[PDB]
Amino acid sequence: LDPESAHRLAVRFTSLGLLPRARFQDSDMLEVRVLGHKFRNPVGIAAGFDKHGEAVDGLYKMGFGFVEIGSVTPKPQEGNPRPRVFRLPEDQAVINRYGFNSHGLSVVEHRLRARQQKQAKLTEDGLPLGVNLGKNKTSVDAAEDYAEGVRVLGPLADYLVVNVSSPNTAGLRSLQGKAELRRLLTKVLQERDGLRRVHRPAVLVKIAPDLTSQDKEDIASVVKELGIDGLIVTNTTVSRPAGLQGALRSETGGLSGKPLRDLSTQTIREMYALTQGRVPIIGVGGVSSGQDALEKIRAGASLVQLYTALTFWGPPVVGKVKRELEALLKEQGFGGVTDAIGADHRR
Ligand SMILES: Cc1cc2nc3c(=O)[nH]c(=O)nc-3n(C[C@H](O)[C@H](O)[C@H](O)COP(=O)(O)O)c2cc1C
Numbered sequence: 198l199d200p201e202s203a204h205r206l207a208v209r210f211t212s213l214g215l216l217p218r219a220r221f222q223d224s225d226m227l228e229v230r231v232l233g234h235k236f237r238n239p240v241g242i243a244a245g246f247d248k249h250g251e252a253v254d255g256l257y258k259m260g261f262g263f264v265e266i267g268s269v270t271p272k273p274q275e276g277n278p279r280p281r282v283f284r285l286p287e288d289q290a291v292i293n294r295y296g297f298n299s300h301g302l303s304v305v306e307h308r309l310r311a312r313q314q315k316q317a318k319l320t321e322d323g324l325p326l327g328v329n330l331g332k333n334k335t336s337v338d339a340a341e342d343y344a345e346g347v348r349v350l351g352p353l354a355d356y357l358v359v360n361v362s363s364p365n366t367a368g369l370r371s372l373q374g375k376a377e378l379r380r381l382l383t384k385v386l387q388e389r390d391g392l393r394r395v396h397r398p399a400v401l402v403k404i405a406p407d408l409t410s411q412d413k414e415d416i417a418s419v420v421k422e423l424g425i426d427g428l429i430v431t432n433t434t435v436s437r438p439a440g441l442q443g444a445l446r447s448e449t450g451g452l453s454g455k456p457l458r459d460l461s462t463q464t465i466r467e468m469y470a471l472t473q474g475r476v477p478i479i480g481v482g483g484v485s486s487g488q489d490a491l492e493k494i495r496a497g498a499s500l501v502q503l504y505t506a507l508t509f510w511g512p513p514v515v516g517k518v519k520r521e522l523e524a525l526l527k528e529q530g531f532g533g534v535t536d537a538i539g540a541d542h543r544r
């Protein structure tokens with residue numbers, strides 16, 4: 198099985214509930230209140246596993262405390278030619294250049310509408326839903342693509358993600374620069390504020406691990422100025438850290454998994470400091486263990502996500518991360534996850 202074939206089968210099996218229901222019962226230690234919601238546990242599935250919102254209920258069954266679908270583009274688009282996903286088994290890493298393959302807003306809108314009240318119950322029970330918004334390859338006006346996403350899927354989401362950090366769409370990461378970023382996020386927040394109160398989601402910005410010090414300072418400034426609700430830190434890296442062994446290490450695309458882990462943790466640490474710990478962070482990149490999760494929480498993450506670990510450990514990795522995180526919190530004298538958020542910054 199090539200990686201993309203495995204991905205398609207994984208989504209199909211998850212959607213059909215063909216996996217053991219997670220025996221691990223979440224303790225009160227793992228509960229987090231952030232972004233106006235209760236999260237039963239802080240371990241989410243990152244964007245790019247369920248791009249088209251086909252497997253949401255199966256992912257809650259796997260034991261995730263929250264699910265992020267997408268990225269979703271306004272119009273349907275095929276993304277890049279195959280092959281476009283590469284396994285680096287020696288590195289516990291993946292390189293992908295999917296290029297925002299998307300069923301598009303209308304198809305995803307109808308899928309989420311079909312289970313909207315089921316989701317309202319799950320959200321009330323501490324299992325929220327995120328929607329990650331992308332832009333079409335041929336789009337002239339990036340802000341209008343994101344605005345369309347807010348209008349169509351904002352009403353169906355607990356939080357929205359403005360993905361300005363895909364490495365696989367020409368000119369996208371340049372939306373991370375200051376004057377353009379202020380214009381883009383002002384338009385996104387105006388559109389969000391225009392939705393009816395019960396349909397009004399939190400808005401987060403998802404950033405690359407590949408930003409300059411200047412880029413990070415500029416993002417922190419704009420996020421505080423505009424009242425952005427949170428940051429997702431980080432997307433995949435276009436860097437190739439020294440020591441990658443995989444034969445496929447020089448494939449074009451975003452690198453995920455263990456080689457991204459500490460680059461992502463350091464970006465969390467920097468963004469927490471630049472926002473004075475006042476901007477909730479979802480920490481993501483190379484999480485495979487309770488230790489990986491707690492390092493991101495101590496660096497300033499309120500929640501974490503994983504993806505690549507699923508491809509090396511399978512579905513059991515979710516319960517593993519939760520059980521190890523609970524054990525480490527007890528060992529280090531934390532009452533719960535909330536007490537550990539940003540603990541490294543208090544020395
Ligand atoms: C195959 C693949 C597809 C992805 N697609 C998306 C996407 O559509 N939108 C997005 O924001 N991030 C996407 N990501 C990035 C993940 O959400 C996450 O930020 C990154 O993989 C780091 O987490 P991990 O090391 O636990 O996989 C994708 C990652 C992979 C491996």
Ligand SMILES: Cc1c(Oc2c(F)cccc2F)c(OC(C)C)nn1-c1ncc(C2CC2)cc1F
Binds near residue numbers: 206507511
């Ligand atoms: C998470 C996941 C599986 O694990 C399972 C499961 F073994 C049973 C049910 C659900 C699952 F997710 C799996 O099982 C293969 C189909 C045997 N593949 N896989 C996987 N997922 C995503 C990708 C992305 C391209 C990078 C690649 C993959 F290999």
Ligand SMILES: O=C(O)c1cc(=O)[nH]c(=O)[nH]1
Binds near residue numbers: 268297298
């Ligand atoms: O669709 C993709 O190529 C994709 C998008 C994104 O945000 N991140 C990633 O690694 N791949």
